[PDB]
Amino acid sequence: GLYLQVGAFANPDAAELLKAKLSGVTAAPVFISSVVRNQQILHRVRLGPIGSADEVSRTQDSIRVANLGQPTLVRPD
Template sequence: MHSTARSQRGNTLVGLVIGLLIGVLIAAAVAIYINFGPKPFTEEKNRAPARPAAQRSTPPTPLPGQPAEKPKLDFYRILPGGESASAPTITSPPKEPVASQQIYLQVGSFQNPADADNLKARLAMSGIEANVQRVDLGTKGIYHRVRLGPYASADAAEGLRARLATEGLEATKVKATP
């Protein structure tokens, strides 16, 4: 009986040593892999492009009726909480030849001016210039409309409307007389 207890103690000790050695070997292998293996998140100067040149993102091209120059973004004025965010925001649409009826795309109408400013900023990040119009609807209250345009033709407005649909935004055509 005395020898059986000694052999069990020896087996436990051997198992413990073998377990420790296996653990140390695994830890060493992981450390070597981390230190000397591939580094996916470091930037290499001679790395091949991840995408073919045809699939690279390009700045958004202006659509018919949109200005050709790059929009100037001043987030301190666009986002709520800026200097002009407390004052009522009324912007006039870009000057174009006056037609009998002008077509606008209305992307949203909000009672909270901050919501209208957030949508305007989201559109600006997509390269689309929007206008926020403050409108008093009498008993319904004051609303802030987010509109794009005016557009000279329904085709020009429809092209932008399709682009907005791909970005998850629903736009409604609105005809307005000057």
């Protein structure tokens, strides 16, 4: 399973909004993974698991077309 991260936010509404928008441009599960980092809560907007490298590439393209951020491969935490 391959995962992308599209943004990471201190504001939870910003993370939830990005999650909602991403659900309109991919069929992969979109979720928020929140962690403590640098004494703050960081809400990381991720999607996956994606079943193939080619689908990752096309999903990255769709996210860029939608102007939603810079979709980056991540290892799930």
